[PDB]
Design a binder for this molecule. Structure first.
Ligand SMILES: CC(C)[C@H](NC(=O)N(C)Cc1ccccn1)C(=O)N[C@@H](Cc1ccccc1)C(O)(O)C(F)(F)[C@H](Cc1ccccc1)NC(=O)[C@@H](NC(=O)N(C)Cc1ccccn1)C(C)C
Lengths: 99, 99
C-alpha cells in the first residue's frame, strides 16, 4: 500500500492472536507496544526518546503481522503512550520512504 | 528519492542557509529542531514523547529544504538529541510510506 502522511500512519497488527492498532514509525529503531501478556521469557531493557527513558520488557523472535505481512523479531512491551512499529520490523515487511 | 530503512533516515536539510542533518520521522506530528536562535517571535509549548515532556519554542512559517524540496511550516526548537522532520513538513514534500 502507499500511505500518505496527512493523518497519523496507524495500521492494524496481529500480535499474540490479538488485533491492535500501531503507528508505522521511521524515527524509531525499535518496536514498542503497550503493556500486554505475550507468551515467553523476557528481559528488562530501558529505551529512551523525547522526555527520558522507560523500562520495557524485551521479548525476542515474536511473530507479528502488519497489514497481513509477517515479520518475526524483537518486541518491547512497556508503558508507551502509543504502539510503535520501528525500523527493526519495517525493514522486514519491505517498507520505504518515497518522495 | 526512495529511502530504505536499514539505517536511520537521516538526510540534509537547509534552514537559515546552513546544512544540517535530520531524521525523516513518520511517527512525529511536529518538526523539532536542536536549539538555535531564530529571528522571529515564538510561543512556548510543551511536547511529549516516549519518556515525558520537554519545553520548546514554536516558530511559525519557517522555510526548510529537505533534499531540495521546500516546505514551510511550524518548527519547535529546544534541546532535542536529534533534528526531527515530522508529518507537518513531510506531507509538503510528497512523502509516502510504501510496502
Ligand atoms: C518528537 C515528538 C514531538 C514526537 N511526539 C509526537 O509526535 N506526539 C506526542 C504526537 C503523537 C504522534 C503519534 C501518536 C500520538 N501522539 C515523538 O516523540 N514521536 C515519536 C513516536 C511517539 C509518538 C507519541 C508518543 C511517544 C512516541 C517519534 O516518532 O518521534 C520517534 F519514535 F520516532 C522517536 C524519535 C526520536 C528518536 C531519538 C530521540 C528522540 C526522538 N523515537 C523514539 O522515541 C524511539 N527511540 C529511538 O529510536 N532511539 C532513542 C534511537 C534513536 C533513533 C533515531 C536517532 C537517534 N536515536 C523509541 C520509540 C524506541
Amino acid at each position: 500500500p502507499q500511505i500518505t502522511l496527512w493523518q497519523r500512519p496507524l495500521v492494524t497488527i496481529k500480535i499474540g492472536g490479538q488485533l491492535k492498532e500501531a503507528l508505522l514509525d521511521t524515527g524509531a529503531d525499535d518496536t514498542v507496544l503497550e503493556e500486554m501478556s505475550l507468551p515467553g521469557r523476557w528481559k528488562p531493557k530501558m529505551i529512551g526518546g523525547i522526555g527520558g527513558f522507560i523500562k520495557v520488557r524485551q521479548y525476542d523472535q515474536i511473530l507479528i503481522e502488519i497489514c497481513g505481512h509477517k515479520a518475526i523479531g524483537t518486541v518491547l512491551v512497556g508503558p508507551t503512550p502509543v504502539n510503535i512499529i520501528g525500523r527493526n520490523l519495517l525493514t522486514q515487511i519491505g517498507c520505504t520512504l518515497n518522495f
